[PDB]
Amino acid sequence: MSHHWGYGKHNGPEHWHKDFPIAKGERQSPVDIDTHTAKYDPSLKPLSVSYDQATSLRILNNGHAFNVEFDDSQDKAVLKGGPLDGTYRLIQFHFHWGSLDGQGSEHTVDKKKYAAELHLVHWNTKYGDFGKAVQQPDGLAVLGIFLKVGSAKPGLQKVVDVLDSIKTKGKSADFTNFDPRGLLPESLDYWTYPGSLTTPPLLECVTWIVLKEPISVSSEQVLKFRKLNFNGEGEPEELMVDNWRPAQPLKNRQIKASF
């Protein structure tokens, strides 16, 4: 209830360390993915994304992004394989995006920034709940997918269309029967490395799995994201744009490629 971090000049990423000192830790995210330096690891398995029984529930403007929430009280939508040991359940997805099409992703690829990045957040079932999982070094698996501006993504349009009902911080709307499979690219080739949450509390609990193939969305789709507000109703309007943390030092990590 006393958090005041954000993405402005007075409360943005350069300030976070003062309340969340792990911001300067050894495994922070995001990072630049240097594609030449990433090593192909033949021992990596194909990723297994099982989203057929996914149960979406609600979409919320939380003042930083919007989250689409899922029932995670059974193994309904799970991620396994790839670099992972065990079963990770989908709890929510959200995006980060820019004020312009040339920025907005958190991860970069040879310093290239995409217009946005989707994060599908999953927690390791051996830890019993999400709150316990974020306290463990292998507690979360975040599947990251880049968005480039081009052709529309039909499977995104239900999200775009509901955004009028959650314009300001604290607003939510029913968001049942949404299929997250509609947000994936054709290929599940990926990079992986150990990292962190990219927002406070910046906990170092994430296995990052970043897909190589971007999805394409239209100019009009991402334009609608930028009409959301960071502020609550009745407060000065601040457009929800540039809700991305920049790349952090790789330090003593190696990024592995599945391909």
Ligand X SMILES: NS(=O)(=O)c1ccc(CCNC(=O)NCCc2ccc(S(N)(=O)=O)cc2)cc1
Ligand Y SMILES: NCCc1ccc(S(N)(=O)=O)cc1
Q: Which residues are catalytic?
A: 64
Select the span of 162-170, 196-204, 211-219, 249-257 touching ligand X (CB under 6 A): 196-204
Strand 116-124 to 108-109 pairing: unpaired
Partner from ligand Y, Zn ion, ligand X, none contacting 238, C-beta within 5 to 8 A by type: none
Which residue is associated with the tokens 């929430």?
Answer: 69
Would you count residue 69 as binding ligand X (CB under 6 A)?
yes
Given 4, 9, 39, 111, the residue binding ligand Y (CB under 6 A)? 4
Select the span of 70-78, 182-190, 221-229, 250-258 touching ligand X (CB under 6 A): 70-78
Q: Tell which positions 14-43 bind ligand Y, by CB under 6 A.
A: 15-16, 18-19
Would you count residue 184 as binding ligand X (CB under 6 A)?
no
Helix boundaries (H) for the chain: 130-133, 157-162, 219-225
Partner from ligand X, Zn ion, ligand Y, none contacting 72, C-beta within 5 to 8 A by type: ligand X
Helix (H) or strand (E) holding 142: strand 140-149
Give the residue with the Cβ less far from Zn ion, 180 or 252.
180
Task: Confirm whether residue 119 is marked as ligand binding.
Answer: yes
CA distance 217 to 115: 9
Partner from Zn ion, ligand X, ligand Y, none contacting 5, C-beta within 5 to 8 A by type: ligand Y
* Minimum distance from residue 231 beta carbon to ligand Y (Å): 15
* Minimum distance from residue 49 beta carbon to ligand X (Å): 16
Which residue is associated with the tokens 């390791």?
Answer: 124
**Letter for the amino acid at 127?**
Y
Would you count residue 72 as binding ligand X (CB under 6 A)?
yes
* Minimum distance from residue 57 beta carbon to ligand X (Å): 5
3-state secondary structure of 17: helix
Would you count residue 87 as binding ligand X (CB under 6 A)?
no
Name 147's bridge partners: 116, 215
CA distance 53 to 247: 34
CA distance 62 to 59: 9
Which residue is associated with the tokens 């080739």?
Answer: 189
Give the residue with the Cβ less far from ligand X, 92 or 248.
92
End-to-end CA distance of the chain: 44
Give the residue with the Cβ less far from ligand X, 3 or 181.
3
Would you count residue 243 as binding ligand X (CB under 6 A)?
no
- Name the nearest CA neighbour of 116 among 159, 79, 81: 159
Torsions phi, psi of 180, nearest 5? -70, -10
Rg of the Cα trace of the chain? Answer: 17
Binding residues: 94, 96, 119, 198-199
Residues that bind ligand X (CB under 6 A): 57, 69-72, 91-92, 119, 121, 130, 142, 197-199
Binding residues for substrate: 198-199
